[PDB]
Design a binder for this molecule. Structure first.
Ligand SMILES: Cc1cc2nc3c(=O)[nH]c(=O)nc-3n(C[C@H](O)[C@H](O)[C@H](O)COP(=O)(O)OP(=O)(O)OC[C@H]3O[C@@H](n4cnc5c(N)ncnc54)[C@H](O)[C@@H]3O)c2cc1C
Ligand SMILES: Cc1c[nH]c(=O)[nH]c1=O
Length: 415
């Protein structure tokens, strides 16, 4: 009987502990389950997921292996596949998310054979004993990347079942799959890594790898990426790996402070006067605030599904501080428009840029919509491509008075 390798947010063959753990014991058959709990989202994210699943199957086929794709509830579909294949056991990577744990417990209950969960590759585990709310102390535990596991050269033959639906993303998607992701990593490392420290703040984010969409679905292992960068070494590598750590820090936070998905890490903001005005929300959501920066950011987001880190922190803070729009609603809408939309990461990003308790970031730090745009964008070429209308980062009829909205926040914040 074969061993089933169940892929979730790990659509890759490189550095995959569950895949090798099973392969070492005997023939394997891969499996992906299209779960309504994950697929019932915006078209752009559903398609991104589906296309990477299609790419995984091709990767299995190219090696002579078999990848099944079933649709439905994991606790019904995994056992079904196990029965049909007469599998001896099921192997997967551990998931520490609320849904992940609920789902896997249900599957374990329905499964008549063992379900073996292995640690997913990380730079720093999220379930670390000590709980840190600040990044620096957390990052000090990192002692370099462990070596990544190799991909199999060829795969044992087996039967293939299931069809992979085709969805209209409603926009241009990056090239799906591990091969594409690996080529991107190489390029970035050979060309951009060297100056990353000096180019990682551009508003158009072209100094970065643009690999987040792949990381989000596990198409690329963070351990492999870090290991590669560290082989290059230098200031660039040090700083870039530090960013990868931020991703792990994000999972660490949500793991130790689950309640932060509900309320700010910083208790003194549990009762901030969030003014839920449906009119302002659309203005922000649509990028019609009048502020060149925020507007161009939200317009690129709606069109591309991607946005640089610098752009995200502005657009995110503007909504929280300059408009006092509640974060809960804003972070959800934000996540849904992102190809790399990751619950834990997006949440820490908002509770950080929003001065809500992450990394003890101070509330008094308030971005200046125009300065930011001139200090992080040359001939305003970025603003030109996404908001041609605006002559410059000059507030041409703001939906609120910037200077006022600022003092308004600072005022409220001091309590
Ligand atoms: C309000 C807000 C919301 C965000 N929501 C998300 C989200 O839902 N999903 C997501 O992947 N990123 C999110 N980010 C973090 C971040 O902006 C991106 O990971 C980054 O822009 C990706 O571009 P890149 O791949 O070129 O990154 P690079 O600069 O090339 O960095 C490489 C990798 O490190 C990780 N990384 C980099 N910066 C951060 C960071 N600040 N926090 C966590 N991980 C980081 C990413 O996986 C990234 O692909 C958010 C940031 C903010 C301020
Ligand atoms: C959390 C965080 C810290 N620093 C950044 O530049 N971006 C982020 O999202």
């Amino acid at each position: 009987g074969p061993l089933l390798v169940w892929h979730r947010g790990d659509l890759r063959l490189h550095d995959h502990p569950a895949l090798l753990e099973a392969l070492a014991r005997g023939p394997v058959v891969g499996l992906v389950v299209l779960d309504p709990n994950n697929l019932k989202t915006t078209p752009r994210r559903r398609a991104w997921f589906l296309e990477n699943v299609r790419a995984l199957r091709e990767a299995y086929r190219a090696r002579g292996g078999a990848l099944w794709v079933l649709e439905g509830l994991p606790w019904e579909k995994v056992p079904e596949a196990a029965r049909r294949l007469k599998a001896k056991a099921v192997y997967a990577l551990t998931s520490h998310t609320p849904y992940g744990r609920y789902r896997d417990g249900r599957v374990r209950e329905a499964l008549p054979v063992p379900l073996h969960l292995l640690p997913a590759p990380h730079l720093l585990p999220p379930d670390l004993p000590r709980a840190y709310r600040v990044y620096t102390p957390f990052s000090r535990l990192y002692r370099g990347a462990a070596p990544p596991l190799p991909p199999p050269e060829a795969l044992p033959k087996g039967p293939e079942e299931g069809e992979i639906p085709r969805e209209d993303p409603g926009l241009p998607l990056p090239e799906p799959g591990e091969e594409a992701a690996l080529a991107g990593l190489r390029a970035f490392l050979e060309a951009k890594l060297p100056r990353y420290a000096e180019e990682r703040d551009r508003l158009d984010g072209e100094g970065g790898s643009r690999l987040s969409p792949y990381f989000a679905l596990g198409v690329l292992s963070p351990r492999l990426a870090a290991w590669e960068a560290e082989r290059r070494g230098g200031e660039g590598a040090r700083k870039w790996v530090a960013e990868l750590l931020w991703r792990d820090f994000s999972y660490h936070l949500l793991y130790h402070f689950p309640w932060m998905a509900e309320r700010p890490l910083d208790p003194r903001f549990q009762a901030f006067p969030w003014q839920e005005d449906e009119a302002l929300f659309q203005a922000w959501y649509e990028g019609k605030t009048g502020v060149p920066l925020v507007d161009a950011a939200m317009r690129e987001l709606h069109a591309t599904g991607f946005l640089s880190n610098r752009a995200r922190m502005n657009a995110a803070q503007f909504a929280v501080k300059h408009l006092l729009l509640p974060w809960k609603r804003c972070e959800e809408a934000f996540r849904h428009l992102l190809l790399d939309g990751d619950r834990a990461v997006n949440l820490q990003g908002w509770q950080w840029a929003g001065g809500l308790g992450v990394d003890a970031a101070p509330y008094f730090r308030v971005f200046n919509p125009v300065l930011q745009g001139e200090r992080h964008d040359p001939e305003g070429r970025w603003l030109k491509r996404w908001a041609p209308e605006y002559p410059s980062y000059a507030p041409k009829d703001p939906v609120v008075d910037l200077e006022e909205a600022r003092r308004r926040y600072l005022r409220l914040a001091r309590d």
